[PDB]
Amino acid sequence: MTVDEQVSNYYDMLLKRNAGEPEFHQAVAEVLESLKIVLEKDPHYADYGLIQRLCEPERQLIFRVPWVDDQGQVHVNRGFRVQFNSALGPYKGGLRFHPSVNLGIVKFLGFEQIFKNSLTGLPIGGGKGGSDFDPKGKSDLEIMRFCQSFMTELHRHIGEYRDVPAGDIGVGGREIGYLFGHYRRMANQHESGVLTGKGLTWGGSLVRTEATGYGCVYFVSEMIKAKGESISGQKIIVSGSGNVATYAIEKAQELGATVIGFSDSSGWVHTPNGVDVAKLREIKEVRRARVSVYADEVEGATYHTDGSIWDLKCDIALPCATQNELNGENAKTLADNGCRFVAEGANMPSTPEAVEVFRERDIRFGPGKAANAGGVATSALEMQQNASRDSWSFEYTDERLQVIMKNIFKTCAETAAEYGHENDYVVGANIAGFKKVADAMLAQGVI
Amino acid sequence: MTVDEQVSNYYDMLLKRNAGEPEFHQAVAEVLESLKIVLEKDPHYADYGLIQRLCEPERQLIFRVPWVDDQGQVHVNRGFRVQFNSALGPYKGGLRFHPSVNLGIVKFLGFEQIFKNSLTGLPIGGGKGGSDFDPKGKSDLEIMRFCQSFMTELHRHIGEYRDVPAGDIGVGGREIGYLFGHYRRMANQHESGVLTGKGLTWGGSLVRTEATGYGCVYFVSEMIKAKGESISGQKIIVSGSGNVATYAIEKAQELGATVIGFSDSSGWVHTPNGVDVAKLREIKEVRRARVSVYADEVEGATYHTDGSIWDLKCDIALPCATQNELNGENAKTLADNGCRFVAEGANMPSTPEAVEVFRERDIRFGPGKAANAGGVATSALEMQQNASRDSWSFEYTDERLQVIMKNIFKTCAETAAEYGHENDYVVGANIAGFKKVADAMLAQGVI
Amino acid sequence: MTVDEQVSNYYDMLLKRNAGEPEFHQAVAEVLESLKIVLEKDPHYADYGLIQRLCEPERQLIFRVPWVDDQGQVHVNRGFRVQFNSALGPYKGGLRFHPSVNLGIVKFLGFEQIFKNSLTGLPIGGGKGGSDFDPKGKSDLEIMRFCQSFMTELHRHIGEYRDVPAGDIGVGGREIGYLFGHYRRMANQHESGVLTGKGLTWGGSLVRTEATGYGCVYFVSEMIKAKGESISGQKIIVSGSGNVATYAIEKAQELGATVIGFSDSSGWVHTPNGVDVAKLREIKEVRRARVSVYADEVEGATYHTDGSIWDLKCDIALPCATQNELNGENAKTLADNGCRFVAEGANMPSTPEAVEVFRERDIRFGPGKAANAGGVATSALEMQQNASRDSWSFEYTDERLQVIMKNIFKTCAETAAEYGHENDYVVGANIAGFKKVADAMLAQGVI
Amino acid sequence: MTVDEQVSNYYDMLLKRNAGEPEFHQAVAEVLESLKIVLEKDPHYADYGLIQRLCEPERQLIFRVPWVDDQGQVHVNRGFRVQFNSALGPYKGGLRFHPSVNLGIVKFLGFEQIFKNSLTGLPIGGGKGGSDFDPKGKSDLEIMRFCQSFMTELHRHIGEYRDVPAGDIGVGGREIGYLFGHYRRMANQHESGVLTGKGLTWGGSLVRTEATGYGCVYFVSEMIKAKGESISGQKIIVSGSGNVATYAIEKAQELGATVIGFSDSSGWVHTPNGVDVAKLREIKEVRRARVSVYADEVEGATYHTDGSIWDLKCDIALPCATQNELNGENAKTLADNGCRFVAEGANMPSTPEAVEVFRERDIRFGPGKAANAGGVATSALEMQQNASRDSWSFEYTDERLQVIMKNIFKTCAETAAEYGHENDYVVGANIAGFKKVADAMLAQGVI
């Protein structure tokens, strides 16, 4: 009968109907804990099956992606698109190409995507997709043929107002190129708004490449200022060395912080006097090389396959690689080494035991649906540019991005306090994200 | 031979082809009277069967709307959509749910919509729709089911560039939600431009709820200033108590006037010190109660089922309920009692004998196609925002609404003056409306 | 390098990719166990990733199905449509509404449908779908609304040349009516070919009701015909009581044959010289009762509830209910009782432990995919009639159903000889099913 | 081995595959000469059959256009739409109605259009169309019937994101009205972005009428400044007397130059003291007369059917009529007479010999794809306004046009000097145009 028990019962239904999907469970569990708080103050938010509707995807698509390799052998990978919620706008979210991908992972990401997209203040619903295809070691022509095969099925389920994909792990500028190209061929339309993360001469927006890392740094700055500090002269750990990590690093150093290390999935680098960003980019973008190559070619910088990047003494930790990369034990050692701020660039990097640790140890924590929202926000700006056939300057778009991140910070911190959990940005994000979606779902009827 | 005979013989054919539609005949007759004046000076506005094309709807849809009530009983209502003219833009116009609705009524409203929409200066054609469904006493779920059944057929005839409905009598925010939600579900597109009057978190515009009533008051203020007067300190009658009336009342009293009465279909309330808007909104929108309840609960306010609201001594009358609610006897009484200005919030509220009494008694008269155009204007601003994926502030949109009502007034005043009927805004509005639609029609050929 | 190392490594990959779906794993294993044989003799059947393509669904759809109950209360169920293979024709297969339905099960049934449909000789591919919706204890309104909600998503993925569903458990004539009606509403097309199982006056086929039943028996008419054991008089234990079983029984006394009683998921029966269907059909379809409401009669019919349905004296046995109703103690005490033939009517009616108890125990099997194909065969005849706008007489359709069932037995016999496991009809069924589909995929390229 | 050999062999291919299309060979020849310069520095622009793809149209449509004349007599003309390249945006370019029209000509125009459109800076791909129809001598109703028949086939190959036509020789404001109107009828969409050159009250843009001639004069003005001279006080020849000629004349005279002659296909007029623009416009647009009538009605102006317009002594020649109207001998006559600047209002007016004479006589030469791009740049601005449902003022749009033409000149000059050929604006335009397009094509894959 109590809120606590209504919700725990749906969660047990959810476990039943979604068996075998631990990451999806993890995401829903974090959100449902926050919804308890919301339904204790405002019980009409449970009316008309709203929660049952919310955690069930509108549509899910799983399809065969055949493709021919350079030796002329045929392979078959699995493609996914989860269209989770469209109450606020077309489904919006990226595409992950990594051998780990399964439906459970795509759903975890699409579900998070709802609340994130809601927080942007922009008109976007949530979705995600990807494939268990492994782009590593493939030639451009293999990637191209895969993108083409994948988009051959996906084209009929997407569109400027329907579902707008983008990149993620394994999907950068190159793959979005092949995807968009082949979309136009399938549809016989130059429909710029169908994808975000496009190149600048064919419909893309200026700050999008930098957006997720910039936005994450902009958000952590807000958290730092609200505690009475400044990001200048702070020491920062950034896990990852892909799209998000690179630009979080760049923005942290423009604002006067020092990034004392970064990583790939092979290991990590200690850079106690900061990162040479041009160098890291030559290394990852041109050479496609490992973080260890940086260490060898940069004096002061040393490679490590032992322990964890989280063993470093820091003020601020920005996890920007993947889900569940920062466990309870990682969280203990950062707290013991003097870390006062954590903000997630990645989607769900912190395990639930790490998030509990941060709270017990009075560490300020920016959840991913808030701190990494600069990307999807800037994607929505790309969409807006496309719908107007306009093209904005870097300085204009970046200003928009700065203001979006401040406003997300502000609604997270105000919503948190409104519901009696001041400085708990998880609660704040989850509730503000949820309320905008729910109020739109109630307006629009049972659909 | 004579222009007079030509237009009159055509009107005679149109009574034959549209037998049994008095309201359509009445709207057509008033316009055609003004067209006689245009054609006496510029006979080439009659070329290419232009008037014969204008007065025949491009398309009319009538359809069965079956729905199930809360007792599991099946009901069947009739749905309508008239797509009248599309020379200037997509068909644009609201939906009326009321038990009096038939094809004649939908056509009168569609026809008027052509000229009003033209007058806004914005790129919108004319249509209207509705059903003979009666929303009164229906539950939210019964209304949702009706809207969903209604839109199951209508979805295929509408679209962002095709036909963009909105609300009207019986169709407000609630119903627009249900219609929009179901459209998205029928189309599988989050196509914001398909309806206007949407809610602020799913593609609506800031001033639209208030726009018609606000616009009506803006328009009448220009009429008033044209005579050397101000709206501040005037006593104003506003018939009706829905969307138009509420905000006409709100605007008028913000500008320092006093609204001395309002009404619904059951009777009328005398409010000599003005109207408490928040109390009337609670009664109408939360409780869906009669205006008699306002009088019960508000001191100074008296309920009447005898006589007419038009019996009150006023400076300004704003009919904001329905067609033919202010007749010739009403018009004499108003004039006798000191009324100097009439502007139509509603569509065609004044009967032809009432309009002539205003002419005989030199009462300044603002016809609905000009005075109530703020609504559809602000709707076009909703479509403009949606096309750009942009959201404008309340102040920005309200300022645009102001300029637009001032431009409309000016166009009606200058055009009347141009054609020899100074201060006859009916003539000016009809002619100014007509000329722009005609010029576009001639340019786009026989279609 | 060996033929058993491709197979077992793909079988192993397939366990990673489709984790948690053991029925699909089983069904893929048995089919692969047969492809080993085909490869030794015909090596080109593994070319161009043929098997990797065959075991991955062309497309899988999972969607939210919201619906409202008689109390005005919102529920959310999950709907499915797997469109496995279309090499021989449009996707073909039924819809199951039952609380045990999940992606794994739909996939397994859809996979088996490919080869079942291939064996018939007709232009049908394979698919399946349904929902976790529980049609037990629902009003007709609730089932209609559910059907309406379900078809509102499903209609955009189906069609006469695309995908043609049918009934199965939980989806009988009534549901097909509701689905077909709403399909027409969404499409604005009387597209009779979109579904099979339709009523007679709106595009149905005359033998469809009696087909799966008449099927199991036309098959036996060559299967026992190879041995002796009389062209008459043999007992038939008929495990089920819906469309397939009721009519399997109904196809009794063709030219003289004792019957014994039957079951559901409550309890079973035993009887003298017959079981007269007249009385089962008024209580199982038109009233919807239990098997207790037949067995309270029937001048002999008695009702057992704790034991097992496979402890009757046989000597022929015709299940026809769900997957997984014959295991360790049933299969061995089926054989015990000097007991000989079988012609099982479910989708995968016996388990992998029961199949060895029919192989080793010399039991002449009539498999799932071959002997109860008369249903799908007659679906295709419905598609044929719709395509030509013809309605065939009963005699004619029944005759065509006899031809088809001859050929299925023939191709099962001839191909089981051709690969030297002669009369293991499981094998020729399984190989002939595979080769037609494989051959079509090879001809049609990498798609 | 050499780039010279590689490109020349390709050209010999192209000559064979496209036999009998000289205008197309001519246009491809001049572009391929500039591309040799690109490949000697950056030879990976030939990667992935880039050039082979660029020179083969994406799609070409040739269709029957039947229509009935005012005497009830049936005629049959041929219609073309070539959709050349869509890398940078939807296909964009005009329609030509003239008796000389054939496929080879449409392709010449379409090919130039790719590079022109690239040069603007705006998101538009390349295409063109037309008909062999001769609108000379036809009634307005004949022209409407032809446009209606033409668009009955064309509408399905076009669209706001697909292909957006416009005017060109024989297709002005009147024809675009008929075309647009019929498009809306075919599509049932008020899709403003489908065409440019539209009228001001139905989605057109201010400045579009003037844009090509205006833009040409803005370009030549930059060429002149770059020699350290000034346009004011110069004598200018403008050939032609249609859309482009008219507004080049107006702009050149506004800037303080004297236009000393102009023409139609029947002869030329010598206007030693300048052109009376209002008079010309009245003769050409209202009376649809020959330029001889201008000479008859204006003292000091003289009609000539002898010799050539290019016999006049001038400082600047602006051919604004048609392809290959200024030949070898014409170029010598102009050079010898003191001409110092040639800018092309028309598409490809200067013969290959003419251009040689210019290079050798030190005459500055503004190729069409740069100098006449103001037209299509302003069409893209019309698309932009339409996509935003917005209307821009004349001042604002004409300032956008001025900046764009300055930027085109700048990119031609800089690019030409960059690749070792300073002041060769042909080289600069061709390389700058190619590079954006080629970059976009590489990103989008083999499509």
Ligand SMILES: NC(=O)c1ccc[n+]([C@@H]2O[C@H](COP(=O)([O-])OP(=O)(O)OC[C@H]3O[C@@H](n4cnc5c(N)ncnc54)[C@H](OP(=O)(O)O)[C@@H]3O)[C@@H](O)[C@H]2O)c1
């Ligand atoms: N791109 C966006 O706009 C965006 C927006 C919001 C959120 N995100 C999230 O940001 C995260 C990374 O995104 P990205 O776009 O930057 O992807 P990316 O460019 O592919 O980079 C991912 C980085 O993470 C590394 N990585 C993968 N697994 C790892 C592990 N277990 N430990 C350490 N490093 C690991 C990769 O290294 P290897 O080369 O060794 O695999 C690579 O350096 C994801 O969680 C994604 O959902 C991205």
Ligand SMILES: NC(=O)c1ccc[n+]([C@@H]2O[C@H](COP(=O)([O-])OP(=O)(O)OC[C@H]3O[C@@H](n4cnc5c(N)ncnc54)[C@H](OP(=O)(O)O)[C@@H]3O)[C@@H](O)[C@H]2O)c1
């Ligand atoms: N909403 C817009 O944007 C808009 C724009 C331009 C023009 N209009 C026009 O403005 C007028 C009012 O629209 P609304 O949107 O305010 O509708 P609404 O919110 O449904 O309100 C209608 C009001 O008028 C009264 N009324 C309705 N029918 C009546 C009748 N037949 N006799 C006497 N009183 C009656 C109603 O009282 P009961 O409850 O007793 O029926 C109610 O108070 C209509 O003529 C409409 O076409 C509306």
Ligand SMILES: NC(=O)c1ccc[n+]([C@@H]2O[C@H](COP(=O)([O-])OP(=O)(O)OC[C@H]3O[C@@H](n4cnc5c(N)ncnc54)[C@H](OP(=O)(O)O)[C@@H]3O)[C@@H](O)[C@H]2O)c1
């Ligand atoms: N013509 C066709 O429909 C067709 C064509 C090809 C294949 N099939 C296959 O044939 C089978 C029968 O389907 P149907 O169309 O006859 O469905 P149906 O009309 O809904 O009847 C199914 C019957 O099976 C019973 N059952 C459930 N659990 C059982 C258990 N553990 N042991 C014994 N019986 C049980 C049901 O009892 P309750 O009512 O108590 O649940 C019910 O009497 C299915 O496996 C289907 O895939 C059918």
Ligand SMILES: NC(=O)c1ccc[n+]([C@@H]2O[C@H](COP(=O)([O-])OP(=O)(O)OC[C@H]3O[C@@H](n4cnc5c(N)ncnc54)[C@H](OP(=O)(O)O)[C@@H]3O)[C@@H](O)[C@H]2O)c1
């Ligand atoms: N309109 C645009 O926006 C635009 C943009 C870029 C480029 N262009 C190019 O500019 C040139 C002219 O364009 P515009 O047509 O749009 O003006 P237009 O209104 O059609 O007028 C064209 C003029 O050229 C003359 N002419 C046509 N063919 C001729 C020939 N074969 N020999 C001698 N004179 C001839 C015509 O005389 P007659 O009346 O005697 O035929 C007429 O005065 C074309 O090359 C076109 O492709 C136009």
Ligand SMILES: O=C(O)CCC(=O)C(=O)O
């Ligand atoms: O910009 C996008 O849509 C990609 C965003 C995304 O997938 C994410 O927010 O993690």
Ligand SMILES: O=C(O)CCC(=O)C(=O)O
């Ligand atoms: O289209 C709208 O905004 C509703 C306005 C309308 O139909 C009216 O002008 O009465």
Ligand SMILES: O=C(O)CCC(=O)C(=O)O
């Ligand atoms: O599609 C058909 O007709 C029969 C196949 C099937 O799986 C069913 O209906 O239960």
Ligand SMILES: O=C(O)CCC(=O)C(=O)O
């Ligand atoms: O504006 C257009 O697209 C028509 C003009 C054209 O085709 C051109 O630029 O030559």
